[PDB]
């Protein structure tokens, strides 16, 4: 009556046969899981990667967090904890909060209590946590190559479900990206304590994500399917409009805690789960999610993109343009990079890339015709992929340019995409230059190579 828990999301227990190939399995459950936004995966009982670490030599800098509903927080980017000293702090905190041993505090109660304390202005509970990509002071919880390994660790070295491997796995089109986009393709490590929370969000470029809980107390999740993303945003806009004022950077995105019952009252479908140690949660493209930790724990998560995602990735960049939001990478650049490697591509990949490329080319044709009729006549080839990203964003909409852009000798170094030709400066169009990566005649043979590889 104070808190009504959302219905449970789907839970999968694949056989060893199904579990062998992660991407085939994900594709299998997709028609179910994409209806709920999140889903949980229980590995076969055998599958138990060796977690081993020294709690005294792993150090990290803690982030601090206030727990207030609808209050703005900034997406993550001093002091120092070891894994042991943080664990001691976290267990003492939970123990003193409930005056109970930690394992006897029911998960139902922590959930009820979380939503009570974030709503009450009178309570000012703050908590700490760890969040960073893997490094020398604190590294992956999965086995990696270096130090000699035991026969069990090397079994799990090349698993698909070893999350270090999906940044470079082939069915993930993110693997082929040449640009170092560390924040996005490398795994993040998360050290939780009781009530530490991740706000409502979707992934950059509407990618998938996958989260593994290595050990410790459970992680509670709320998820919304991708088809309801904009319903959720309209509810958020009405109840907390400050979160929507234009962000200066992509290191200035604002997010918040919000009760799922509030969303359910406004007809947004929400699902929940408790993720325990040894379990995976998977999020689908544009599926909103949030949650909190029940106690001291350690998780590891990574973004990825299947061939299924390619059309959504294009729609997402279009959506970023309307919103004037920064991109993490150029989607078109990624497509052309794969086309240029067509001979070594997986054939299903090749077929799906070909379809996206065909849309890209037809859209680019129409845009070039439009700017020609605006009086832009001069043109020159330009290798956009050699420019630092901050040197090739459209002045107006902030999109990362790759296929083409307009420049002018008047504003040296500035660019606009072909949608915003009128937003560069006050000179007449004949002083402008179309800068392009490829002619249409370069592009049709690149697409043809994909067609041949796909057969």
Ligand X SMILES: CCOC(=O)c1c(-c2cccs2)csc1N
Question: What's the closest the beta carbon of residue 12 comes to ligand X, in angstroms?
Answer: 19
Distance CA(44)–CA(311), nearest Å, equals 33
Binding partner of 420, given Cl ion, ligand X, Zn ion, none, CB within 5-8 angstroms per partner class: Zn ion
From 191-199, 305-313, 425-433, 441-449, span contacting ligand X (CB under 6 A) = 191-199
Distance CA(335)–CA(147), nearest Å, equals 38
Radius of gyration of the chain (CA): 24
Strand pairing of 188-192 and 208-216? unpaired
From 4-12, 224-232, 263-271, 417-425, span contacting Zn ion (CB under 5 A) = 417-425
Strand pairing of 432-436 and 378-381? parallel
Which of 386, 395, 391 shows the shortest CA–CA distance to 417? 395
Binding partner of 190, given Cl ion, ligand X, Zn ion, none, CB within 5-8 angstroms per partner class: ligand X
Q: Which is nearer to Zn ion, 235 or 415 (CB)?
A: 415
Question: What's the closest the beta carbon of residue 246 comes to Zn ion, in angstroms?
Answer: 15
C-beta atoms surrounding 133 within 10 Å: 16
* Alpha carbon 175 to its chain's center: 15
330 assigned ligand-binding residue: no
- What's 384's DSSP letter? G
Q: Which is nearer to Cl ion, 68 or 400 (CB)?
A: 68
Contact call for residue 396 and Zn ion (CB under 5 A) = yes
User: CA dihedral defined by 441, 447, 452, 455, rounded to 10 degrees?
Assistant: -140
419 assigned ligand-binding residue: no
Binding partner of 391, given ligand X, Zn ion, Cl ion, none, CB within 5-8 angstroms per partner class: none
Angle formed at CA 335 by CA 331 and CA 341, multiple of 5 degrees = 145
Q: Which of 23, 86, 198, 309 lies at the binding interface for ligand X (CB under 6 A)?
A: 198
Burial class (CB in 10 A: 0-12, 13-18, 19+), 386: exposed
Distance CA(176)–CA(42), nearest Å, equals 29
For 37, phi then psi, to 5°, come to 85, -50
Burial 340-353 (b: 16+ CB within 10 A, else e): eebeebeeebbbbb
Question: What's the closest the beta carbon of residue 118 comes to Cl ion, in angstroms?
Answer: 5
Q: Which of 301, 394, 405, 454 lies at the binding interface for Zn ion (CB under 5 A)?
A: 394
- Residues 270 and 196: beta-carbon distance below 8 Å: no
Query: Which of the residues 201 through 230 are near ligand X (CB under 6 A)?
Result: 211, 219
Binding partner of 131, given Zn ion, Cl ion, ligand X, none, CB within 5-8 angstroms per partner class: ligand X
209 assigned ligand-binding residue: yes
Contact call for residue 288 and ligand X (CB under 6 A) = no
Binding partner of 123, given ligand X, Zn ion, Cl ion, none, CB within 5-8 angstroms per partner class: Cl ion
- Residues 277 and 214: beta-carbon distance below 8 Å: yes
201 assigned ligand-binding residue: yes
Question: What's the closest the beta carbon of residue 17 comes to ligand X, in angstroms?
Answer: 29
Burial class (CB in 10 A: 0-12, 13-18, 19+), 5: middle
Contact call for residue 68 and Cl ion (CB under 5 A) = yes
Query: Which of the residues 104 through 143 are near Cl ion (CB under 5 A)?
Result: 123
SS3 assignment, position 149: coil
Contact call for residue 129 and ligand X (CB under 6 A) = yes
From 155-163, 217-225, 386-394, 447-455, span contacting Zn ion (CB under 5 A) = 386-394
Contact call for residue 66 and Cl ion (CB under 5 A) = no
Angle formed at CA 167 by CA 164 and CA 171, multiple of 5 degrees = 120
Question: What's the closest the beta carbon of residue 185 comes to ligand X, in angstroms?
Answer: 16
Q: Which is nearer to ligand X, 280 or 384 (CB)?
A: 280
Q: Which of 92, 100, 182, 427 lies at the binding interface for Zn ion (CB under 5 A)?
A: 427
In this structure, the chain runs to a length of 455
Tokens found for residue 427 = 């000179």
Site string for ligand X, 131-160 (x = CB under 6 A): x-----------------------------
Contact call for residue 86 and ligand X (CB under 6 A) = no
* Alpha carbon 423 to its chain's center: 31
Question: What's the closest the beta carbon of residue 352 comes to Cl ion, in angstroms?
Answer: 47
Contact call for residue 83 and ligand X (CB under 6 A) = no
Residues that bind ligand X (CB under 6 A): 76, 129, 131, 190, 192, 196, 198, 211, 219, 293, 299, 301
Annotated binding site for 2-oxoglutarate: 129, 209, 211, 219
């Amino acid at each position: 009556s104070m808190f009504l828990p959302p219905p449970e999301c789907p839970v999968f227990e694949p056989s060893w046969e199904e579990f062998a190939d992660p991407f085939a399995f994900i594709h299998k459950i997709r028609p179910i899981a994409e209806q709920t936004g999140i889903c949980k995966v229980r590995p076969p009982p055998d599958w138990q990667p060796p977690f081993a670490c020294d709690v005294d030599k792993l150090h990290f800098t803690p982030r601090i967090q206030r727990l207030n509903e609808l209050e703005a927080q900034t997406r993550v980017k001093a002091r120092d904890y070891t894994l042991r000293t943080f664990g001691e702090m976290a267990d003492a905190f939970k123990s003193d909060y409930f005056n109970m041993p930690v394992h006897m505090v029911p998960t139902e109660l922590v959930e009820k209590e979380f939503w009570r304390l974030v709503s009450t202005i009178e309570e000012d509970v703050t908590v700490e946590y760890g969040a960073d990509i893997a490094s020398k002071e604190f590294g992956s919880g999965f086995p990696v190559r270096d130090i000699k390994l035991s026969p069990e660790e090397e079994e799990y070295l090349d698993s698909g479900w070893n999350l270090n491997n999906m940044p470079v796995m082939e069915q993930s089109v993110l693997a082929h990206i040449t640009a170092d986009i560390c924040g996005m393709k490398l795994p993040w490590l998360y050290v939780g304590m009781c009530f530490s929370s991740f706000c409502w969000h979707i992934e950059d470029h509407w990618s998938y994500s996958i989260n593994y809980l290595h050990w410790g107390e459970p992680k509670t999740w709320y998820g919304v399917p991708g088809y309801a993303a904009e319903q959720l945003e309209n509810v958020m806009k009405k109840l907390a409009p400050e979160l929507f004022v234009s962000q200066p950077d992509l290191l200035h995105q604002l997010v918040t805690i919000m009760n799922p019952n509030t969303l359910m009252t406004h007809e947004v479908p929400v699902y929940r789960t408790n993720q325990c140690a040894g379990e995976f949660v998977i999020t689908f493209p544009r599926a909103y999610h949030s949650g909190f930790n029940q106690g001291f724990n350690f998780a590891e998560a990574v973004n990825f993109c299947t061939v299924d995602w390619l059309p959504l990735g294009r729609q997402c960049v279009e959506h970023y343009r309307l919103l004037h939001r920064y991109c993490v990478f150029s989607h078109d650049e990624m497509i052309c990079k794969m086309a240029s490697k067509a001979d070594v591509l997986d054939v299903v990949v090749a077929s799906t890339v070909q379809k996206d490329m065909a849309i890209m080319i037809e859209d680019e044709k129409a845009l070039r015709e439009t700017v020609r009729k605006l009086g832009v006549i001069d043109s020159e080839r330009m290798d956009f992929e050699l420019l630092p990203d901050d040197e090739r964003q459209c002045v107006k909409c902030k999109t990362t340019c790759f296929m083409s852009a307009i420049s002018c000798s008047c504003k040296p170094g500035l660019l606009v995409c072909l949608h915003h030709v009128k937003e560069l400066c006050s000179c007449p169009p004949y002083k402008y230059k179309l800068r392009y990566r490829y002619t249409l005649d370069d592009l049709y043979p690149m697409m043809n190579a994909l067609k041949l590889r796909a057969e």
